[PDB]
A paper describes a structure:
The proteasome is a proteolytic enzyme complex essential for protein homeostasis in mammalian cells and protozoan parasites like Trichomonas vaginalis (Tv), the cause of the most common, non-viral sexually transmitted disease. The 20S core particle forms a cylindrical structure consisting of four stacked rings, comprised of two inner rings of seven different β subunits and two outer rings of seven different α subunits. Importantly, three of the β subunits, β1, β2 and β5, have proteolytic activity and are therefore responsible for protein degradation. We address this challenge by creating a recombinant protozoan proteasome by expressing all seven α and seven β subunits of Tv20S alongside the Ump-1 chaperone in insect cells.
By comparison, CP-17 bound to four of six catalytic subunits, corresponding to β2 and β5 from each β-ring. For CP-17, the α,β-epoxyketone group is covalently bound to Thr-1 forming a morpholino derivative. Beyond the S1 pocket, the P2 tryptophan of CP-17 interacts with the β2 active site through its indole ring that resides on the hydrophilic ridge of the shallow S2 pocket, whereas the indole ring of the P3 tryptophan is buried and fits well within the deep S3 pocket. In contrast, the density of CP-17 in the β5 site was clearly defined. The ligand was positioned in a highly similar conformation to that observed in the β2 site. The α,β-epoxyketone group was covalently bound to Thr-1 and the P1 phenylalanine is located in the S1 pocket, which is lined with Lys33, Ala46, and Ala69. The P3 indole is anchored in the relatively deep S3 pocket, defined by π–π interaction with the residue Phe27. Finally, the hexyl group of CP-17 sits in a well-defined shallow pocket formed by the hydrophobic parts of four residues belonging to the neighboring β6 chain (Tyr116, Asp136, Pro137, and Val138). For instance, the arrangement of the S2 substrate binding pocket in the β1 subunit prevents interactions with CP-17. Despite this relatively high sequence identity, the fine structural variances within the active site pockets present opportunities for designing selective inhibitors targeting Tv20S over human 20S, as illustrated by CP-17, which inhibits the Tv20S β5 subunit with a 10-fold higher potency than the equivalent subunit of the human constitutive proteasome.
Residue numbers in the entry:
A (entry chain A): 2 to 240
B (entry chain H): 1 to 204
C (entry chain B): 3 to 231
D (entry chain E): 9 to 126, 134 to 246
E (entry chain F): 4 to 197, 206 to 233
F (entry chain N): 1 to 208
G (entry chain C): 2 to 199, 205 to 239
H (entry chain G): 5 to 234
Write the structure that this text describes.
Amino acid sequence: SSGADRYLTVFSAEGRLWQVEYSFKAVKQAEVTAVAVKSKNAVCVAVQKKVSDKLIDPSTVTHMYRITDNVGACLVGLPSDVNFIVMLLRSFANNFEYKQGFSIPVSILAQMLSERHQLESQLVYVRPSAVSAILFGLDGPSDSFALYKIEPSGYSNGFRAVACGVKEIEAMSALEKKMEDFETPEATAEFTLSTLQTVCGVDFEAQDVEVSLLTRDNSKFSKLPNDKVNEILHAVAEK
Amino acid sequence: TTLLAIQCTDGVVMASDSRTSSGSFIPNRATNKITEIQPKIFAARCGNAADTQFLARAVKNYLNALNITRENTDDSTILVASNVIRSLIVRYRQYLSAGVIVGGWDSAGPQVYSIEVSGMAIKKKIASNGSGSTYIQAYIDQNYREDMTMEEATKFAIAAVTGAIIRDGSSGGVVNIVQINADGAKRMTVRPAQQPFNYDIVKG
Amino acid sequence: DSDFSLTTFSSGGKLNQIESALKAVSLGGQCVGVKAKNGAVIACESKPSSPLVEKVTNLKVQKINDNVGIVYSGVNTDFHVILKSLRKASIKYSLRLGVEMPTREVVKHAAHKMQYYTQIGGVRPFGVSLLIIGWEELGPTLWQVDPSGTFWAWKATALGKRSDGSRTFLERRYSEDQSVDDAIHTAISTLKEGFDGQLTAELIEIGVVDETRKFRTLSTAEIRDFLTE
Amino acid sequence: DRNVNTFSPDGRLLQVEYAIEAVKLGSSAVAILCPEGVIFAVEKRLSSQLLIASSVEKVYAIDDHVGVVMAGLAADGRTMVEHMRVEAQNHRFSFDEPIGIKAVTQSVCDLALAFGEGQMSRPFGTALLVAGIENGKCHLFHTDPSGTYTECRARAIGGGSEGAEALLRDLYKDGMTLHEAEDLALSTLRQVIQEKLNENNVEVACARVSTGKFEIYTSEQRQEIVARLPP
Amino acid sequence: SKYDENATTFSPEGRILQVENAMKAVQQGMPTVGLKSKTHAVIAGVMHSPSEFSSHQPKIFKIDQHIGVAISGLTADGRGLCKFLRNECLHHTFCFGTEIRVADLADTVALQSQKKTSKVGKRPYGVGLLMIGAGVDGPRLFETCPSGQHWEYNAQAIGRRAQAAKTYLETNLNEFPDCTRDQLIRHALRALNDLEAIALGVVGIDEPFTILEGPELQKYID
Amino acid sequence: MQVITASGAIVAAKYDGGILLASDLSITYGSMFRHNNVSHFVEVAPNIIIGASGEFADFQTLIEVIKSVILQQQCKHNGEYLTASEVHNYIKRYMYQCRSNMKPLSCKVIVAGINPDGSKFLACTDPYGASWESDHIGTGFGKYLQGLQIADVVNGSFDDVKKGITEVFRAVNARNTTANGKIEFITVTPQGINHLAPEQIDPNWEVV
Amino acid sequence: TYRYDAGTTTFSSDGRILQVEYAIQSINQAGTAIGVQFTNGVVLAAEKKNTGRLVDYLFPEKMAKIDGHIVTAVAGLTADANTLVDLMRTSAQKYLKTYDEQMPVEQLVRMVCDEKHSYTQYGGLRPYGVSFLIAGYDRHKGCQLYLTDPSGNFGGWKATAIGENNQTAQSILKSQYKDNMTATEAMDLTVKVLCKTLSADKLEFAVLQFREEYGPKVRILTTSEVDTLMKRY
Amino acid sequence: GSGYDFNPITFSPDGRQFQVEYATKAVEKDSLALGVKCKDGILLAAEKNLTSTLLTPGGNPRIFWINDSIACATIGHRPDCYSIVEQSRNRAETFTSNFGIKITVPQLASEVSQQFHLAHYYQAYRPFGCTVIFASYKDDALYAIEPSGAFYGYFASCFGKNSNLARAELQKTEWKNITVREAVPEVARIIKSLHESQFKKWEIEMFWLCEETNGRPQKVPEDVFQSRFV
Amino acid sequence: DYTRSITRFSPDGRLFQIDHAHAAVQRGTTVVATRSKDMIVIAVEKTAVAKLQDPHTFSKICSLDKHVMCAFAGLHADARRLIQSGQRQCQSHRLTYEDPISIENIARYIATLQLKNTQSGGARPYGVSTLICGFDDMTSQPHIYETLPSGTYAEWKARTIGRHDQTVMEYLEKHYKDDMTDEEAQKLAIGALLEVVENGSKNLEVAYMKRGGTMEIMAEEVLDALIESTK
């Protein structure tokens, strides 16, 4: 038996796509964890921000990305693959807005990313893009906060709360154990950052984490400035 | 059509009529000829509604493409919009018969770029286009002031587009105004009842 | 180069990539089908990866057109590719012919696409087996399409995890003269046998083609009613 | 295993070297250039007496003035001959002049490395001896599967190429006559083959400066050369 | 060894072993020397002699009126690269009406070879070039490598026996800048020990690139 | 060859110290005086300026192409600019390729520069790609309303060539409907490109 | 790089395309399909691959009508068999469109076999692991039966068998096949061969029959018709 | 990698892209090039270990023009270095063609990381054995793209041999608090201190994009800094 | 599209894929082509056909054109593709040139198809040797070219391809005559195949093209008469 199953995205004798799972491992090689919590009133994604040098410009070390003005994408994984998926998601959103005339929903963008990961996991000549993508944002047609997570396999699912990265398992456990229908965007952000801080085991400072708290007042995607993140972290430390 | 984009000190005032003309018929008398490319990028459209709407659609597409690989989404966006409209008018010069005044606000401040039907993109502080703009040229020349604020430029633009409306059959209806400053764009509609003057200024 | 078939015959005259894709199907979540006298049912275990998952955002039981619905066992992402392809094919069929693609034609299109990916180069087979239910002139019809593009009709079936025991259970418990209600109950029972732990309405998806000839996905409330009835 | 485009650690193109071996397995061909022209003498390997020798051709008239003689894979040499004929007629059409012998040789050699993978699948398994008359000057080149054409005054390609070179090293002179060139080519061919040289198993040709033409010898001319041979 | 199958495969030590094999192909070519002065550049090459009755196969080629390349390695690869160089020269003259610079031709050759190594199925050029050109940027000598990189040299020696020629060039390196055209030809001939097998193409800021062989080279053989 | 937004006449003429180009700063939409203070000349290199008469959209297309090509060659040549001869050769080739693709640039393009050898280079490519190098070139009514004012002083003192160009542009302002505004003058000299203050060249209106 | 390329369109030392040989093996492990050419028509009879009490015999798995005059039986991969059946139907309809005549059986066979052979010789893609018993009628050769294999090699057979136990079916056909059979006699022979080399439900049948006035008609027997035919045996 | 290091698009069981990090090793082997964002500009120094003394002193650039305002220092496989330089020039030219403006170093970095990523994402390509440091003073940007395509903006970037020691030294200097002219002695000090004695003749190709150059990529004049060393 | 170098030189200078295609030819059935001044006879051994196999319209013999007969040995589908290309080429030659394609030209074309398959990336060689025979004109001598999987083609007085090619060729050499009549050529081919056929009447088929005629299958009665006359 040839070894194509372990080097290319073809099924092994166990019917597993080894390269897809290795792209999951490559996602975990990002060394960062992202926790996204989507409440009725807000969606907060907090991804711990690790800069390896003091000589790297921190503003360039990001996992939050503007896909559209509305849709944000917290991409965890290989930085080259993260950049590729950022530009691919932006191209998907642009093509969708051009063909359909309106900004891409988070759900459709998640499905398009899932299709890209399916063509990577089916086309043997295309690598699975080692990116776990937490797409999020206020869908206007439903006026509700969409939060989809697309795996490197392309497994896309909407989430009330999701996690990605190294502590994805622990973060998911904490989310599904302590999740609530938070009444305020501040509550959603506090829970997101508290879950991320707990699973990471390190008390965070605003510089150490990127937070995007999309609310109905501010539905446009944007990384929260370090002052708002610091206020959220203080609220977390308040309890 | 009448289009009049004024780059003021504190913003851009893009005025237009609302009359789409199909011969002597007005298929759309409440036409919004100033298309919102982005919250602070607007395209006042003159010429074939299909062609100019395709230009607005394609410049939105090209501005999103410009933002695929960058995070400074607010940089050179008016200038890139004008360059893209110019490139599309030149590329589809045979097909497209469209002139776009792309005005608005970006990181570089308030900017108006008139891309003529020829595909000639020029940065202007006072750009006018359309069959109606002709009738107001002297008016603009004698009533435009480089120091006009966005309020003063808005009043002047309403008056000029009203004159073009009155004198131009192809221009008519309401004056669609877009005031784009750093804070965003405000749309106003000056219906014929609210316009400074009407047909009665003709010979009187 | 890319365009060389990675699905090739082995010494024994077996396409080993086909068997690998069938294995991927056999680890892809239990899905059941049951042909009633007056309809057909495609149920499936839809145990989300986490409770935080939103069920409606990724449903295994899907509608291909008004009359044809589809569930799958295997890789969810290339099932979504197959499903987009089938919906597009049925829309093209409606455009060309003014009617929804027939159940057997939807099945043949799915089989053709899977076979294509079994033969063209640079690709693996689809790691999904589809249970497609839809009506035809002679009655309801459940169909299985394999990663190989080999399709065949069924009276009852299971495809995913523990599908051999589920198929034996259907052999024992399936009857020809079942109603759509009884087919739904049989599908739920087969899922229960193929599933460990409490089998609730939120953990399964049911699609049904009933006397009306139209495919509908039962909501969680209908599934709860069936569980409690 | 490895691609046809693989370079060996020594730096040799493995497929090119293997094509050169295939050439070494081909029928012997000797080109002798004299100031009065140039002579091809190639072994025709008549495997059977029912094989029509006239159809087994190593010598091909590329144009009126230039011709080639092959060693190795006859079909690959046929493709090279087709290219050379198309290029000689294209040069005649484009410039109203006979193609230069160097020009046509280089043209065929530019096709030698055109093989690849991931165009031809492999190098040409045939080496050529291209002899012709350019501006009244007799030119002779030898091309190997590597696409390396080198102008020659006396060369041999095929089974006994090394032996033919050894023989010519002390038999070929730069001031021979056309008759002497014919004798040397035929003798070198006879000494570097495993059969007897008669008018049927040998194909002779001359790019002659006097006529400025590449003419493949008829049976009578080959018989004459065979008869004149001292041994 | 197992990483030495494609020009697309890096080795664990970050090397493209097939590129290095094409480089070894170049290193096994005939000696080729290039010299650069303030006003003239020279490439002298010992043309290969496959047989005693074979005229030495030319290696010093004429690319542009003021650019000439000495190809060392696979002659057919060198000829394909020279056709590509003629295309680049033709397109530069078409676009701008001026002769392309040998630096630009070296860049194009480097890009072509790098493409040959950056995609599977295509193979690195077994040939390495010594391109001398005297243009507006002056006289410039470039050693273009199969890997897809070129080095601008005041002088260089490639192929077999290249070490002794390189050492000789290093000895007289600081002399070359002001050396006269005849002096530069003489330096090239000294650095390149085999006479008839030696071609020598010389270009200057004023004089075009011209190839001298045997008799034409006798005045400088010394 | 459609000219909707037209740049008007250009009059370039060599004088002792360089090339003096002149043109109004007006773009005309048909007969309309549409835009003002639009230099018909674009400095593409420190010693190469390019003007055009005719479709100014096509001039902008050409200037974008020229600037892209100059930037490409600057990248190749460590920031070194193409010579005026090279830039004009590329413009000739581009405009002839556009006329052969049947999408001609409806602009007569003047390339005025100083070559690195210090030689004044004044050339012109017509919309059809026909190009020529002259010591003085008129485009538009700068060619027609020209007489001998430039030919008699071309390569003369800056004052004489300026006076002749001023005569030609007085003729243009008098007799060209599309002539609007002050005539900007530009000296392309070995010391760079200097935009002299635009002058209102007045026709003699005592004629009335 | 072709590291995992199987060289499908590559000869083996024996001169055999290994992929084609393995496709032939795949066929030989598939349900038996027997063709018997009688006086006016051909009886094709295949073993369904997917059978069982829970399987619904709604469609012929192996029997595929190519055109009013051509029917096929499948041995091997029913998927690529369906692909080649679609291509055969399209080719027969293209011939009808071009000539307003029903495609001669040998031409349709040649077309499907050229498809198979193109996969065996070019493209590096796996061959069609299907063997067709193409029964058909044309005015030239009357009623014909063609056995086609993955190599693209086809031959006309008065009777033949492919699939599992194809040699036993071939031997039975040799023993009992006679020329100038009737439709009933050939159907009986096919049923006898299938039963001796192997249930009505599992078996499927298709009779091509040429009547002088009605033309050539293909009739793929349904479950009830095959059950009646089996009970007659 | 037990077979996971021959195909660039192949992940190791640990998710490693072995061909990509072999390209990174090709980068590490090359002589160090470092960019420093200074207050007056950005200074791209590139150590050039002249293997042969016959190399033209004013040649073999490690730093290239990408725009009138973008320079590109290169580290690693020189063929890949120049291929990426030409592809970055093409990306900037295409950016101007599409949008009529000059690309910014962050955006050029994204677009060129696209090609880097394609190298190890689609089959039949080879990862680019090069890191490219794009410096633009107009953009105030110093973005290094690694062979994987991972591109980051830097206050002071450095790649190649002894790049870790070079980064440590670059940390000791607040480049944005000093000008490029007074940063040149510090950068030259760092390179000389980390320079390997194996090479007796070597150079420091120093470009700067500064107010003095109006943001233009200019090789530092020899009067300001003598790159030649023996 | 797939472009792997299926046919590549081995270290010894052989194209192993061509050797395997020759093996496929050998596993193919035996064909013998013989020529009389005004006739060409191709006798092919029918494969062992059971009572259940239709023996009509499945002969290895084919007419590439009204003047060109073809027979093959090797993979039947490869030969079918070659014959389709050859017939298309004969009609294409008639279209481009009013003249019928010369037997040399069509044999060259088929052998060049085989050569292209040995040169085309991703194309398997034709596992088929083709005896392509015919008359160029009314006055032209009959031609019998043999084209091999390697793409080489050679004209033969009489040739055999397929299994038993050694034995049938030996018989041809022992029994060939320079000026055989139509009957003598028919007898030569029939006996050459008779030596290696279990049955004479059954396993053997014959097709003859006389001068100024098309492909013509032998009558079973006349074929039996010739077989019995030979024995």
